[PDB]
């Protein structure tokens, strides 16, 4: 049983590496300055943003950039989900439901991998935009950016690696209590096994942190409240900003969400 849980953990990690180009390992190699690759271009104000356009209203332009990356990330997450044993055999409408309610929780999680207290890696690590530049963006855009860093700081304190994250993300996707699911048990059964794989992963990979599994279960709960607030912050933008356009994929995900 345990051997099979480790094989599952490895399968998920290998799929995670195929599905997500910029891993936390690669990202930390960039942020700490340990890569043979040339440094990311730092964007900290309007002037540096202008200069680095080829390397990578201003607030609206940055928001659209976030949208384009989110659309790309949704497609990466979808490919990863399809690698989770049993997922593609679920009712197709349930697969859609799991992604609809799952993707933004996963994006919050995976953004953390690319973030430190000072900023976020963008354009596959070719750019680095500072937290304070993003927070300084005029209302209501500044307050849309900051919560992602606030979560990242707390989440990164857990010191998870890519192997941990692969299973954590899989558990989140296979949540049997998403609104409107038709066949709950097959999803719950997959999640129960993924949760066993996660517990064993954390016991072996973080032996001196017994609390980690319980904390991660709480983070899954926290992410729901975080994403609800994210959806509210988007309404302060979408409803008030007249020339604001949402990408069709994102419009679909946000439509009738909760």
């Amino acid at each position: 049983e345990s051997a099979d849980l480790r094989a599952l953990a490895k399968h998920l990690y290998d799929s995670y590496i195929k599905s997500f180009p910029l891993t936390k390992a690669k990202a930390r190699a960039i942020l700490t300055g340990k890569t043979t690759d040339k440094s990311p271009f730092v964007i900290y104000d309007m002037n540096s943003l202008m200069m680095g356009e080829d390397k990578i209203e201003v607030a609206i332009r940055i928001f659209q950039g976030c949208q384009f990356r989110s659309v790309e990330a949704v497609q990466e997450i979808t490919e990863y989900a399809k690698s989770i044993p049993g997922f593609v055999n679920l009712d197709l409408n349930d697969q859609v439901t799991l992604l609809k309610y799952g993707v933004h929780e996963i994006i919050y999680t995976m953004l953390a991998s690319l973030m430190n207290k000072d900023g976020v890696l963008i354009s596959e690590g070719q750019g680095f935009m500072t937290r304070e530049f993003l927070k300084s963006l005029r209302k209501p855009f500044g307050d849309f950016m900051e919560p992602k860093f606030e979560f990242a700081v707390k989440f990164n304190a857990l010191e998870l690696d890519d192997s941990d994250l692969a299973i954590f993300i899989a558990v989140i996707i296979l949540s049997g209590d998403r609104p409107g699911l038709l066949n709950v048990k097959p999803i719950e059964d997959i999640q129960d096994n993924l949760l066993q794989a996660l517990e064993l992963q954390l016991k072996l990979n973080h032996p001196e942190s017994s609390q980690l599994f319980a904390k991660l279960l709480q983070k899954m709960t926290d992410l729901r409240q975080i994403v609800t607030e994210h959806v509210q912050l988007l309404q302060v933008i979408k409803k008030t900003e007249t020339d604001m356009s949402l990408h069709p994929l994102l419009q679909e995900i946000y439509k009738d969400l909760y």
């Binding site: 979808t78 593609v88 197709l92 697969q95 859609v96 994929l249 679909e252």
Partner: peptide
């Protein structure tokens, strides 16, 4: 019929 469904069905 949706974009998520189309992404899910692509091999």
């Amino acid at each position: 019929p949706s974009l998520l469904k189309k992404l899910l069905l692509a091999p």
